[PDB]
Amino acid sequence: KKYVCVRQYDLTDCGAACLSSIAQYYGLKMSLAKIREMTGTDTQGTNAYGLIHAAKQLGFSAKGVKASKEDLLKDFRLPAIANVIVDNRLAHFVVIYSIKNRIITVADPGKGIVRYSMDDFCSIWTGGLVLLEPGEAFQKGDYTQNMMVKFAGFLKPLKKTVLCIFLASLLYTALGIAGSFYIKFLFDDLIKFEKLNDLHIISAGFAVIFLLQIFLNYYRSILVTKLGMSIDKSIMMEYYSHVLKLPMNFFNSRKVGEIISRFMDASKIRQAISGATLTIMIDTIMAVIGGILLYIQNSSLFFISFIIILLYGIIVTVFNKPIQNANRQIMEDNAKLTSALVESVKGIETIKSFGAEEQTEKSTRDKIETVMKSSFKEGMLYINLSSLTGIVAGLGGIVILWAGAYNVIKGNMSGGQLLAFNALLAYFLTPVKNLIDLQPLIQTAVVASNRLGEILELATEKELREDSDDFVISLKGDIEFRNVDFRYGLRKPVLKNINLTIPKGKTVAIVGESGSGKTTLAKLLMNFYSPEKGDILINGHSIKNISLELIRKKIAFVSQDVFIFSGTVKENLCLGNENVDMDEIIKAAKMANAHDFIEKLPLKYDTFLNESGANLSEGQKQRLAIARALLKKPDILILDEATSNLDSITENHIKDAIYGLEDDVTVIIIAHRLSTIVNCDKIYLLKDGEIVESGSHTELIALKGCYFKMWKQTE
């Protein structure tokens, strides 16, 4: 079969791209985002265990082994995934496709199908190797959609606008073709026979024709701009509105840059949905008419012009791929240079302290030299292309003039006819030139369409929910954690066997070391992610059987890393609550020590917070988050290390406000310092993905164990 090389869309999906390439080689094609989510790809890339798990899910029979340099000589299953260390710095996954005579062919998702000397490969190859093979159930499929038709369906509401552009272009082309005979009428008829009044009349007519052509171009340009802007808005809004509905496994498995960069893909798609189709429809007919007219003028000159355009197309097609390879290399080098510059500026204090202003300058100079070399390579490619195209164009023009003069001498045509042919050369060559130049745009548009539309197929948060029982309207009750396992994707499990019960309305404390997994349970209670095994029950009813809406309004969260949105204080304190009066906000500002702070701020609860509230310090934002959570009016309220950044007075006020909370509401306090929370109704100490002992402080101290040791060592 042909060697399939699925280029990676992101910087961390090289393993997913390799698995997709193997699947496509073996006859199974699907979206790269789906394979990316089954591989458990995260912001740090993919490990071999994820690839094995995803391959076994797909129907393969995967196995991860470590091989030596000699094992490459021994014949095994050729389509295997292998680890390489690019630049001896970064890990990478590639696809080995055949074992040849001291030459290794590998699909690198970042580069393409490349060849290496066995020495070079084995120098960069790590011992890691993954072997893939279809199992009993590997029904070949094509579970992907043509994303160009899906985004071209946005042209249906704007069929009138597209139709008007077509008619305007037809009239513009007709007027230009008619006006390209002025030079023929001059030399052959008016100048030769010395006609003055006819000269003036015909010249005025052609000026009027040109003015009409200009007006038509103006109108068509306005319409094209409007169409492009409408398509851009539609695609971007669709993508963003779908992204806001996707589950949380989507958001934390991707960088912010990866999610945001799909917004330029909307413009890339629009450049072909509107530009390419309109260009094809107009220029095909315009080129056909121009070629027919040129052949009417003279067959030999038309054949010469056809040869000219054929040579230009050949040259451009030949130079296409190297130019884009050079551009990709330039982009990579620029990204490396800007990352180095940002790192050097951000960590200036360390560099000054250690006296490293000399080697940092040398490293930046080396990176700038690399960028300059890549820029020179691309500039040389463009210069060679321009030189060849200019040679073709100029020699074609000279040859056309030469052959036209020869034909005029032989009497096959007149001088005016030759000049009219030279004029119509534009209306014949520009259409074909544009049609050939559509090639780079369509490939980029296809790649961008795949990138953007593979996300629009992902199931949203609501679509993955089990049927909701409508009889539950109150989350008040005991919170029971059965045998609950959890893991962020396909990494080491965080929670193992946490079985616990939280009574109705009683304050509960969870303590442990950093990285133990407390915030993990805090998010699992809020239906961010789901337990791998077991279930989470509230008042007997399972959480999954309750509507996702009722979970998010009746449960409030105060994370350790609070987030502030750019907006007024009232807007920040009421994010989803669209109907709240001022007095409730005022009261909520009381128990969170926010009224005193914001009163001293200029104006009142209307100040816009610039750059995610960069003006306020960490404690002030944490108090704001406390106030928002209290204003939410929850039945369960979780505080994940909320008071760590606060002072003594603020911590005391928060404590006596939370303890003296009205209504039968449950409070969960996740803390690292035991002395912060000691009077809680019950305390749960979980160390390795499971609780080892539960009880009050008077009960935990008496019973010798992990909690007693931690209390003795910390205090």
């Binding site: 071999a48 196995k63 082994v65 990478h92 990494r491």
Partner: peptide
């Protein structure tokens, strides 16, 4: 065959970012 099979921990340790 053709190699030494890694266990699960070694598999997850084989980072390919």
């Amino acid at each position: 065959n053709i190699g030494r099979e890694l266990t699960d921990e070694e598999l997850m340790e084989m980072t390919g970012g």
